[PDB]
């Protein structure tokens, strides 16, 4: 895998500081937590919603 | 957000409660083992504790992030605190009572008006359960809602000094506590206790349910007993030392009896009347949760 390739992730403070309020004003459900027991289909449902 | 384990937040090593003793960080249980009790002719019987009021005092419009844990711990064990009901910021806990409130209670023991970065905070559901009860500290001064500050101490005695048979009976002889002692032992004890992050204890106390709760109540009985001990010394009529062949036994008379004293003394922390009303309230709520 290339350096751009991989599993993206970010700190919660970065999430809160930036993306979260934009999630609020765009009128969407707060994106689901992933327990690790979570289905990929559920993640698809969340990225969809 | 700090996740809450299947046990309490108290299971986390981050929230260990430990008085200093013999140069080490002793657990409360291994301090309470040092304690011994002389019985006296008087008897404590425990009356039913009145149900705490339905009312949650208004969290007045406060721009600031209140330092609540400091306010509570200093009101209960603080060496110098007074007029604890003048400011009345305890009511602020009821900001946390609402569903989906923006406010967060940080592990710092501060009630932030909104979630903010790089400040870990307790799970909001847990805090809501905790606030639904302990916001009532905010009405510890209002005349309609004041707790009894005499009878409640019976429970304290039973929960501290009481042998398991005395606890089952609901009635124990008034006792006189004593322990091998270093200079300033009760001051140092109380200050080791002011530093305790007790909102962890109160929050697990209000949030946990079922066996997971009961498993908490056994595990932290000694902690609750240490808090009760510091309050007991705060309200004890007198606190002497005894020479005992080149050793000293600190002795407080009496466990479970509030003397209503308010004049300050070197030996132990003192309650102003406001601290008495507050502590009475705190005991009302906490014992109510403890026996259900």
Curated annotation (Swiss-Prot), chain A:
It is found in: Virion. Disulfide bonds: none annotated. Homodecamer; each decamer is made up of two conformers of VP2, called VP2A and VP2B. 12 homodecamers assemble to form an icosahedral capsid. Belongs to the turreted BTV-fold inner capsid family. Inner capsid protein that self-assembles to form an icosahedral capsid with a T=2 symmetry, which consists of 120 copies of VP2, with channels at each of its five-fold vertices. This capsid constitutes the innermost concentric layer of the viral mature particle. This is Inner capsid protein VP1. The chain holds residues 841 to 889 of 1333 of the full protein.
């Amino acid at each position: 895998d290339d350096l751009d390739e991989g599993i993206r992730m970010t700190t919660y403070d970065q999430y809160l500081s930036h993306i979260r309020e934009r999630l609020h004003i765009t009128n969407v459900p707060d994106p689901i937590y992933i327990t690790g027991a979570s289905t990929p289909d559920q993640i698809a449902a969340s990225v969809q919603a | 957000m700090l996740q809450q384990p299947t046990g309490g937040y108290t299971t986390l090593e981050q929230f260990a409660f430990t008085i200093r003793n013999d140069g080490t960080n002793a657990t409360p249980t291994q301090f309470l083992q040092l304690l011994s009790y002389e019985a006296t002719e008087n008897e404590l019987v425990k009356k039913t504790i009145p149900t705490p009021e339905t009312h949650l005092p208004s969290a007045r419009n406060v721009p600031g992030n209140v330092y609540i844990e400091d306010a509570i711990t200093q009101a209960l064990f603080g060496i110098s605190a007074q007029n604890v009901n003048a400011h009345g910021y305890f009511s602020r806990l009821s900001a946390l009572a609402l569903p989906n409130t923006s406010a967060r209670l940080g592990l710092d023991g501060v009630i932030y008006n909104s979630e903010t970065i790089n400040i870990p905070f307790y799970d909001p559901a847990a805090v809501a359960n905790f606030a639904a009860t302990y916001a009532k500290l905010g009405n510890a001064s209002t005349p309609r809602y004041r707790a009894d500050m005499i009878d409640i101490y019976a429970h304290v005695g039973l929960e501290l000094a009481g042998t398991d048979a005395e606890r089952a009976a609901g009635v124990m002889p008034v006792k006189r506590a004593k322990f091998d002692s270093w200079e300033g032992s009760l001051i140092s004890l109380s200050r080791d206790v002011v530093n305790w992050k007790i909102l962890a204890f109160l929050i697990d106390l209000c949030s946990l349910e079922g066996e997971a709760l009961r498993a908490f109540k056994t595990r932290n009985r000694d902690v609750f007993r240490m808090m009760l001990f510091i309050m007991s010394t705060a309200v004890a009529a007198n606190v002497v030392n005894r020479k005992v062949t080149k050793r000293v036994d600190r002795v407080l008379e009496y466990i479970g009896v509030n003397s209503m004293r308010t004049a300050g003394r070197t030996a132990t922390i003192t309650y102003d009347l406001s601290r008495h009303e507050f502590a009475a309230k705190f005991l009302q709520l906490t014992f109510t949760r403890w026996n259900a």
